[PDB]
């Protein structure tokens, strides 16, 4: 009824704030991005440093894996995204078109497409093979904080400081739904559930909300943590028990029971804001990453 996550490894090497961490879909690797303009790769199970991937001209806010674990895409303050071959380190494409910082990115499950969100308030859809922008969505009226495809890639959910979550038809580019609560504080994060039926969104009033997408209604609420300033990544954890996992501006990793909404664990170790968390695809393993005063990534493991 409660996980028992404990610190196993601390990964040091970035020289500025870390911005995101993501496990490869094959579960072998962890990728990290940082304000230091670098991508680093680490062993997912032992935290062993693997390689540094370089090329962006300014800091990086987000990284994401292709479904076959062979490619990465990164989103940078230099207004570009880059597509990387992880094994060779080669930059395969530079995606140009956004007119301001690119803040978030993702492959679709098929991995023929990339979605990106920007401080220029647009969501763009890119062709992986050619690097060309296929669609530009007038998505929001403030910076876009997160973008994510659903399980079959037919849908995109986006979030923004404008207080909205919007769901988009990938093929047509049409806005299918706008999620509106009793209030609209800045939405700093959003992502689909594994089955794509639900949407987890974070707002800058210290609140995570779980939405039923089809019914367009908020069902569960998760609080107790601190989140008023930063775009902190959260997760469904489904390898053991069903949990919600999130970073927090009090330097802790928070873990909630998905159903009861109670806090079940709080992980201590970081010395600055935990900006990012990731859940391993098959094992009960959490990766967490922290901002400038800390700069380390931590790997935690649990029996459930």
């Amino acid at each position: 009824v409660k996980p028992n996550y404990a610190l196993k490894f601390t990964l040091a090497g970035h020289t500025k704030a870390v911005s995101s961490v993501k496990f490869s879909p094959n579960g072998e690797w962890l990728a990290s991005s940082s304000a230091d303009k670098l991508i680093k790769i680490w062993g997912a199970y032992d935290g062993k440093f693997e390689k540094t991937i370089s090329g962006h001209k300014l800091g990086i806010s987000d990284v994401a894996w292709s479904s076959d674990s062979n490619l990465l895409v990164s989103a940078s303050d230099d207004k570009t995204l880059k597509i990387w071959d992880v094994s060779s380190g080669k930059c395969l494409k530079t995606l140009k078109g956004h007119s301001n910082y690119v803040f978030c990115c993702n492959f679709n499950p098929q991995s023929n497409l990339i979605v990106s969100g920007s401080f220029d308030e647009s969501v763009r859809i890119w062709d992986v093979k050619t690097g060309k922008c296929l669609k530009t969505l007038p998505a929001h009226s403030d910076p876009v904080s997160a973008v994510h495809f659903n399980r079959d890639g037919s849908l995109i959910v986006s979030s923004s400081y404008d207080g909205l979550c919007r769901i988009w038809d990938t093929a047509s580019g049409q806005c299918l739904k706008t999620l509106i609560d009793d209030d609209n504080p800045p939405v700093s994060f959003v992502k689909f559930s594994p089955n794509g039926k639900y949407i987890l969104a974070a707002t800058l009033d210290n609140t995570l909300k779980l939405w039923d997408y089809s019914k367009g209604k908020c069902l569960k609420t998760y609080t107790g943590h601190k989140n008023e300033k930063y775009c902190i990544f959260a997760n469904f954890s489904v390898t053991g028990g069903k949990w919600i996992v999130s970073g927090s501006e009090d330097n802790l990793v928070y873990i909630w029971n998905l159903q009861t909404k109670e806090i079940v664990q709080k992980l201590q170790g970081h010395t600055d804001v935990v900006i990012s968390t990731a859940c391993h695809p098959t094992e009960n393993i959490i990766a967490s990453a922290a901002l400038e005063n800390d700069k380390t990534i931590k790997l935690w493991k649990s029996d459930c």
Partner: peptide
């Protein structure tokens, strides 16, 4: 009331 975020 018990949500299932995994089954498709």
């Amino acid at each position: 009331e018990e949500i299932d975020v995994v089954s498709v």
